[PDB]
C-alpha cells in the first residue's frame, strides 16, 4: 500500500528511488543518551532521505522529524484464537469414546 502511494507520487513527479531495510528492524525510541535507534535514527544521522511505513505520528517523534499530512487513520486492536463449541452427528454418542 505504501509502495502503491509512493509510485503514485513517483510517476507524477519523476522520483527515482532505491529502498533498503533499516538494520535494527525497529521503528525506534529515544535512548538514554538521547540518540534515536531504528528508522528515525537513520533520518537523524542523515543516512537516508525519506522514511515510509506504518510510522504513526506522535509529538515526541514530530519534534525531530517533519511529517506530511496523514493519509490513513490509526486504531489499536487485538488478535485472539478461535474457540470450539460445535455440533455433529457424533454428538449423540459423545459421552463415550468410540
Amino acid at each position: 500500500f505504501s509502495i502503491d502511494v509512493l509510485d503514485a507520487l513517483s510517476n507524477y513527479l519523476g522520483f527515482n528511488y532505491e529502498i533498503y531495510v533499516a538494520p535494527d528492524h525497529k521503528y525506534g525510541s529515544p535512548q538514554e543518551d538521547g540518540t534515536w535507534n531504528g528508522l528515525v535514527g537513520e533520518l537523524v544521522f542523515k543516512r537516508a532521505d525519506i522514511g515510509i511505513s506504518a510510522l504513526t505520528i506522535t509529538p515526541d517523534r514530530e519534534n525531530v522529524v517533519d511529517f506530511t499530512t496523514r493519509y490513513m487513520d490509526y486504531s489499536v486492536g487485538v488478535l485472539l484464537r478461535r474457540a470450539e463449541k460445535t455440533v455433529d452427528m457424533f454428538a449423540c454418542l459423545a459421552p463415550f469414546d468410540l
Partner: protein, 196 residues
C-alpha cells in the same frame, strides 16, 4: 471489544516492547486524572516483572504465540485484519477499536523542502478517490474466508433440532434393515422347510 479484557485473568496479554503502543499504554495507565478505568487496569498485567514476562521482541513471535500458545496480542488493528483474513485456516479472529487524531504519515528529514509538494498530491489523491480505490485494493471484504465467520449467534435457542441428533435415527433405521434381512432369511429357509 476491550473493556471486559481488562478484567479477565485466564488469558494473559502483551505487546512489542518499546513500540508506540507500549508507550501509549504506559501513558494512559499511570495517569490518575484519566476518566476511564480500563487503561489503568491493563498496565498491571503488561508490567508484570518489569514487563519482561508477557512481552515479545517482534510481531511475528506475537502471532506465533497466539496461534500455538495461550496469549493475546495487542497491535495495530489495520494490520491484524489482514492477518485474520489471510490465515489459510481462517483460525484467528480480531476485534478493533475506534480511535482518531493520530495517523500514518511520511517522515521527511528535518527542514527538507518537499513537505508541501507531497501534501499537495496527497490532497489531490483524496479528492480523486484514488485513496479509497487503494484501500479497496488491499483491504477487500473477502479472501480465503470472511471475517463475519468470526460471529453469528442469532440462530441459537437451546432447543434441539431435527438434524441436530440425526445419528440416533440411524440406529432405528439399522434395526429396520437388519430385521428385514432376518425376516428374509427366515422366509428363505421356510421356503425349503415347507413348514413352520
Amino acid at each position: 471489544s476491550l473493556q471486559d479484557l481488562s478484567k479477565q485473568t485466564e488469558i494473559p496479554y502483551g505487546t512489542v516492547l518499546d513500540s508506540a503502543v507500549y508507550e501509549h499504554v504506559r501513558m494512559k495507565g499511570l495517569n490518575p486524572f484519566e476518566r476511564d478505568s480500563m487503561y489503568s487496569q491493563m498496565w498491571r498485567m503488561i508490567n508484570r516483572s518489569n514487563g519482561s514476562e508477557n512481552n515479545v521482541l517482534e510481531s511475528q513471535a506475537g502471532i506465533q504465540k497466539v496461534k500455538y500458545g495461550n496469549y493475546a496480542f495487542v497491535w495495530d488493528a489495520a494490520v491484524l485484519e489482514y492477518v485474520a483474513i489471510n490465515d489459510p485456516d481462517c483460525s484467528f479472529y480480531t476485534i478493533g477499536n475506534t480511535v482518531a487524531d493520530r495517523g500514518y504519515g511520511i517522515a521527511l528529514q528535518h527542514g527538507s523542502p518537499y513537505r508541501d509538494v507531497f501534501s499537495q498530491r496527497i490532497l489531490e489523491l483524496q479528492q480523486n478517490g484514488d485513496m479509497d480505490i487503494l484501500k479497496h485494493k488491499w483491504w477487500p471484504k473477502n479472501g480465503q474466508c470472511d471475517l463475519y465467520s468470526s460471529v453469528d449467534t442469532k440462530q441459537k435457542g437451546g432447543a434441539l433440532d431435527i438434524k441436530s441428533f440425526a445419528g440416533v435415527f440411524c440406529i432405528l433405521a439399522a434395526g429396520i434393515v437388519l430385521s428385514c434381512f432376518i425376516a428374509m432369511l427366515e422366509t428363505w429357509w421356510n421356503k425349503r422347510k415347507g413348514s413352520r
